[PDB]
Design a protein around this ligand. Structure first.
Ligand SMILES: Nc1cccc(CN2CCC(O)CC2)c1
Lengths: 237, 300
């Protein structure tokens, strides 16, 4: 069944599972034409496929060439997502293949189910959670590799950096979702918080700054405050 | 014209023959149905006055034998049987007609309804969906489940309709996942018509038989099958022109004949609204769309 608040700890058990987010696969800018009509220009996108237990992010970059000459792109984008996820699963050793794939948007369910007919034992699940994975393109190094790609490409990252050396997967996922919720609600403020102190750097092989345990608690507090406020400034409370 | 005699009517029962029905009282002097049109299959069906649970009945074709009905007090139902002694059968029938103890199959001469509902239905194909090879007639009731239903428990008593499943490897060619799921023409024309049914007439016959079992017995798996076979055509971009025209006639007469008070359970909102207004064939079912809108605008 669907994933929700009540069965949240299943994400961190020892059954392999992947979240798939398709919200950044088909990305466009809308502009005016010389004749004063409106047109879209696509930009590079990505599939966000994440193991919440390990931090493994399979970032499949979607180059604009994949849309050339195609119609109904928003619809194609869900099927292209499902094709690429199915191809990823097939490329993995049997003991690394997921036992469940959780899609962040229900419109992915049928495209993924059809592409995975060869894997009847892999459960395809929706979720009731409003997960903030769309904000992954607010992570500078992830945005940078997507925009620079000149061809289809898969890039591998641990989205948790080295956090699992010190914290549990449950706590790592809570931190990640808090960071991404903040980046989605107010990107500028969230990024100001993360970088304000120049003495805290981001390692070349990491995505986030090298905060101490104490500094993470402060950071996490600041991101919470932001999310309440922006909910203020938004709902006037 | 053919006759199905009744040994007797020991229990109060509503008897149907095709789309006609009549009430018979406990131990009323009823000895059968005469003037049944030759050239069509028929169904004779029963609903006991006590237990409205279980409508049941028999599909038969009078060209394939002499059939009669006899109540069994141990199993508690009216059973169809074959009489092999042809002289014994004419004598029984002629006596019962002489004593005028039979109802006449009450067809109006202008009326093509039954032909229109059973145009492609063949007794030989019914006997493959309903497996009971020692009889020339086929028993169906409200509770029988379909093969596909049993996959998601007695196989001998199942309705072996052709399994249709839009999210299955049979329906979906590797590497044509999106194409085949959004346009089911491959599945309809190659897998089902060419591969399984051989021709559109056998496809339509199964579709019409599923509708009739849904209507006469409230058989739920039959209703699922009827709707699946409609949706497979309507969701195909490429359908022979003759099939679409005939489908429009088939459905028209099915919707025309459905009891109005049963449309709430026998008609699937999603399939009909998709078929009539969203699918590739949304503009190809003019007669069916007109009767649906005038008779069940609520559903839509
Ligand atoms: N998505 C995914 C799948 C497998 C392993 C990893 C970890 N990986 C990321 C950085 C590389 O420099 C090597 C280590 C990530």
């Amino acid at each position: 069944g669907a994933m929700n608040s009540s069965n949240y700890a299943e994400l961190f058990n020892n059954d392999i599972k992947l979240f798939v987010d398709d919200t950044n696969v088909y990305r466009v800018t809308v502009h005016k034409t010389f004749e004063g009509n409106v047109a879209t220009k696509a930009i590079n996108g990505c599939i966000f496929t994440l193991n919440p237990k390990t931090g493994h992010l399979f970032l499949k970059i979607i180059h604009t060439s994949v849309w050339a000459g195609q119609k109904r792109l928003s619809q194609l984008a869900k099927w292209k997502t499902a094709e690429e996820v199915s191809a990823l699963v097939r490329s993995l050793p049997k003991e690394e293949q997921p036992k469940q794939i959780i899609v962040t948007r229900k419109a992915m369910l049928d495209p993924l189910e059809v592409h995975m007919l060869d894997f009847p034992n892999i459960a395809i699940r929706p979720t009731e959670l409003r997960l903030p994975f769309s904000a992954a393109m607010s992570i500078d190094k992830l945005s940078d590799v997507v925009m620079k790609a000149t061809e289809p490409q898969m890039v591998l990252f641990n989205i948790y950096d080295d956090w699992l050396d010190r914290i549990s997967s449950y706590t790592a996922f809570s931190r990640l979702t808090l960071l991404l919720r903040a980046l989605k609600t107010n990107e500028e403020s969230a990024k100001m918080i993360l970088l304000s102190d120049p003495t805290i750097t981001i390692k070349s092989y990491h995505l986030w700054p090298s905060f101490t345990d104490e500094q993470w608690i402060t950071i996490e507090s600041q991101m919470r405050d932001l999310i309440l406020t922006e909910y203020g400034r938004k709902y006037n409370v | 014209m053919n006759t199905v005699p009744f040994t007797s009517a020991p229990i109060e029962v509503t008897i149907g023959i095709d789309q006609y029905s009549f009430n018979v009282k406990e131990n009323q002097p009823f000895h059968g149905i005469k003037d049944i049109p030759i050239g069509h299959v028929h169904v004779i069906h029963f609903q006991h006055a006590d237990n409205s649970s279980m409508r049941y009945g028999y599909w038969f074709d009078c060209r394939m034998g002499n059939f009669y009905i006899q109540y069994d007090p141990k199993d508690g139902l009216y059973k169809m049987m074959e009489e092999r002694d042809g002289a014994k059968f004419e004598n029984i029938v002629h006596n019962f007609k002489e004593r005028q103890m039979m109802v006449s199959y009450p067809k109006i001469d202008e009326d093509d309804t039954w032909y229109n509902l059973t145009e492609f239905v063949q007794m030989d194909k019914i006997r493959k969906i309903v497996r009971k090879d020692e009889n020339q007639f086929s028993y169906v009731d409200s509770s029988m489940t379909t093969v596909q239903e049993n996959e998601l428990s007695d196989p001998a008593h199942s309705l072996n309709y052709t399994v249709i499943n839009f999210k299955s490897r049979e329906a979906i060619r590797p590497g044509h996942e999106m194409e085949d799921f959004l346009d089911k023409s491959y599945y309809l024309n190659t897998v089902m018509l060419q591969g399984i049914f051989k021709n559109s007439s056998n496809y339509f016959g199964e579709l019409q038989f599923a509708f009739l079992n849904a209507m006469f017995f409230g058989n739920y798996g039959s209703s699922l099958q009827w709707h699946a076979m409609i949706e497979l055509i309507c969701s195909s971009a490429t359908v022979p022109k003759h099939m679409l025209d005939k489908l429009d006639e088939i459905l028209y007469y099915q919707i025309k004949t459905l009891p109005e008070q049963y449309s709430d359970i026998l008609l699937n909102e999603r399939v009909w609204n998709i078929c009539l207004y969203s699918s590739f064939q949304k503009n190809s079912l003019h007669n069916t769309e007109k009767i649906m809108e005038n008779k069940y605008p609520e559903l839509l």
